[PDB]
Structure formats: C-alpha cells, structure tokens
Amino acid sequence: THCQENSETVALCTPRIVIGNLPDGLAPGPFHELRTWEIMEHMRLRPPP
Amino acid sequence: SLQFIGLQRRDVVALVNFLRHLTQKPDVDLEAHPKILKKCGEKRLHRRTVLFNELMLWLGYYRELRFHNPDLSSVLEEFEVRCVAVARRGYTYPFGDRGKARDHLAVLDRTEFDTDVRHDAEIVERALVSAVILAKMSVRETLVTAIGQTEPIAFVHLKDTEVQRIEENLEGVRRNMFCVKPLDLNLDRHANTALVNAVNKLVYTGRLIMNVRRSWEELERKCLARIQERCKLLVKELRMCLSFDSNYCRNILKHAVENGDSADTLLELLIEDFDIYVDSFPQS
Amino acid sequence: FVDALKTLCHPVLHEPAPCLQTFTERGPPSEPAMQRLLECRFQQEPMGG
C-alpha cells in the first residue's frame, strides 16, 4: 500500500499472515467453503456430528 | 417575565438586572459570572427548588442570547464587496500559471451568502483559503501540497505589530460578540502589492465573521447542554413523589429542548400555569 | 502440489524485498483517479486513556 506520513507519501509492505487475507475476487468465499469440506472429509467428518 | 420560588426579592431583582445589562459587560458567558449561579442558593434550599431556579435562570439567559444575536448583514456586504475587489485585482496580475489562478478566481467570484445564519463560516473559509492561495502565488512563497491537507489561513507579509493588534481585536470580539466594531486596518500603499493588500483586508473581515459565529455557536451549545441536563435531573428528582401537581410538573418538563423555539415553548409553558406545580415544591 | 515443494518452500518466494524496492522506485501513481486510493493515515497512539 501507499500511505501518508507527516505530509509525505510512503510505501508499506506487510505479510498476509493467514490464507484468509487473500482478496475475495482472488480467493472467494465459496472456495473457502469447499476447502473446508475437503479438510473435513480428510478428517472423516464428512457427515459432521 | 422570569419568576421562580424560594428567593428574596433583592436576589430576584439582582439577577434580572444582570440579564438586562448582559450585552454591556465583558465575558458574556454565564460561567464567567459564578456569583450569579450561587445566587440560586445551593446548600441554601432544597434540591428541587434550587434545580428549578437554575433551570429558569438558564432558560432566561438562553432567551437573552437568542434575542441579542447580532445582525451580521452589514459586514457580510463588505465581505462580498471585498471578494469582488480581490477577484478583479487577481484577474490582471501576471501570474506564471494562469490555470490554477483562474480556478481560484472562479471559486472567489462565485461566493455569496444565502441568508442562512449557520452557513456563513464555511463560505468564508472557502473564500479565504482561495484568496490566501492567490496571494501566496503572487508573492511566490511556497504553498502546501500534501494530499489531504489545505493551506492555513494567515496574513501575507503583514507588519508584525499590526498582526498582533488584529489578533487582540479578534480576541476582544471572542470575549463579547455583540458590540463588535472593526476599524483596525493600518495597511498602507507603499509596501506589498495591491493584490496582497486586498487579500489581507478580505481575510481580516472573514476571520472576524468566523470568530463571532463560532463563539455564538459554542455558547449556545453549552447553554443547551446545561438546560437538558437540568431538566433530566429535575425530572428524576420529582418522579419519586406521585401526585397531581408533581405529575403536571413532570409532564411539562418532559418536553425536549434542542432548538430556540423549543426553549421558548418550555419557558412560556412553565410561566403560564406556574400555579399548578408550585404547590408541589418545598420551601426553606 | 507435494512434488512442487522443490520450489514452493525456497526462500526466494518468501522474500518480498525486491518487490518492495521496485514498488518504491516506481513511485505513487500520478493519475487523478488513483489519488483517492493514495490517501490514508495510520497513527501510533498511547493506550493509557
């Protein structure tokens, strides 16, 4: 991002700590739902309690 | 007029003449005169009656403020004239970049007042920032460019002693906003261009208008807050005793106050049927 | 994906420093539309009160 610092514009870089922070248009919600289903099936919780 | 319980007539006449001579004293703020407040008699009377007295005093003070509200129209006309003069003089100046100069000339020449008493300050600020930008460009001193930021309003190349004198006059206006009379411009024809001189006069007039309006608005807001909180406290105090007169007083007090008209209605309603709720209040 | 680990876990992917450097060198956008995206302020403040 670009940001303001006492009348100057500066650049800022930060890590996306978790996979959820990816933009929706680039990793949408339905994809997260399907990935959660995948990991649940891997854990044998495919029909959950 | 104002009338309330529990006070000997000397204190009554004292405070009503205080209201009468309100406009002709410095520090027209009520809290600037604490002896008037304690005249209501805290620790002297019961909580109910002292709250009633303070509420009545604040209502009367608000009415006096709203009545004495200055007719700024005289100096608004001069401000418009000076905006026109600054624009006309700024057209002919040989600016290096005519584009942004023409933009600021346009915003200057568009300015006018719509007779809404609350809208004056922002119009003045817009005109003043454009004029100061033009003056700074004319003297070609540097000007702010950071995004989300605007040029501060200040005099350009004005003599320091005259600057502090103008600040003193503006402080005097801020102390008492009703007797304002500006005359102070000792500006001269020798130093500084004519455009700079016009901008300085315009910014003086505009800042005077801004200061008077802001002072009045702040004082009114404080008065409204005091009235509202007094009404809340008095209603809570009175609610514990269920009785016809107490219920009548509570129903009167339940009216919300957020405008001068609402304050007038509440004050007149308290005055008109004072007999009903006076029986409920204790004395001494 | 498990075969791709020869690349996916190499340090070069996780170093953002050259990307930040070129991002700074290019500078903030000059287009007027991009300006609305340029303005943001972040303040460090004491937590006492």
Curated annotation (Swiss-Prot), chain B:
Q: How is it modified after translation?
A: Phosphorylated by host CCNA2.
Signal peptide boundaries:
none
Q: Where does this protein reside within or beyond the cell?
A: Virion tegument; Host cytoplasm; Host nucleus
Q: Which family does it belong to?
A: Belongs to the herpesviridae large structural phosphoprotein family.
> What job does the chain carry out?
Participates in the last steps of viral maturation and release. Associates with nuclear capsids prior to DNA encapsidation and later preserves the integrity of nucleocapsids through secondary envelopment at the assembly compartment. Interacts with host CCNA2 and thereby blocks the onset of lytic gene expression to promote establishment of a quiescent state of infection in undifferentiated cells.
Quaternary structure annotation from Swiss-Prot or TrEMBL = Interacts with host BICD1 and RAB6A. Interacts with small capsid protein UL48A; this interaction links together the capsid and pp150. Interacts with host CCNA2.
State what protein this is by name: Large structural phosphoprotein
Q: Which organism is it from?
A: Human cytomegalovirus (strain AD169)
Swiss-Prot record, chain C:
* Compartments it resides in: Virion; Host nucleus
Note the subunit structure.
Homomultimer. Makes the hexons and eleven out of twelve pentons. Interacts with triplex proteins 1/TRX1 and 2/TRX2; adjacent capsomers are linked together in groups of three by triplexes, heterotrimeric complexes composed of one molecule of TRX1 and two molecules of TRX2. Interacts with scaffold protein; this interaction allows efficient MCP transport to the host nucleus. Interacts with capsid vertex component 2/CVC2. Interacts with the small capsomere-interacting protein/SCP.
Function summary: Self-assembles to form an icosahedral capsid with a T=16 symmetry, about 200 nm in diameter, and consisting of 150 hexons and 12 pentons (total of 162 capsomers). Hexons form the edges and faces of the capsid and are each composed of six MCP molecules. In contrast, one penton is found at each of the 12 vertices. Eleven of the pentons are MCP pentamers, while the last vertex is occupied by the portal complex.
Q: Give the family, as the similarity comment puts it.
A: Belongs to the herpesviridae major capsid protein family.
The protein's name in its UniProt record: Major capsid protein
**Top-down, what is the taxonomic lineage of the species of origin?**
Viruses, Duplodnaviria, Heunggongvirae, Peploviricota, Herviviricetes
> What is the name of the gene encoding this protein?
MCP
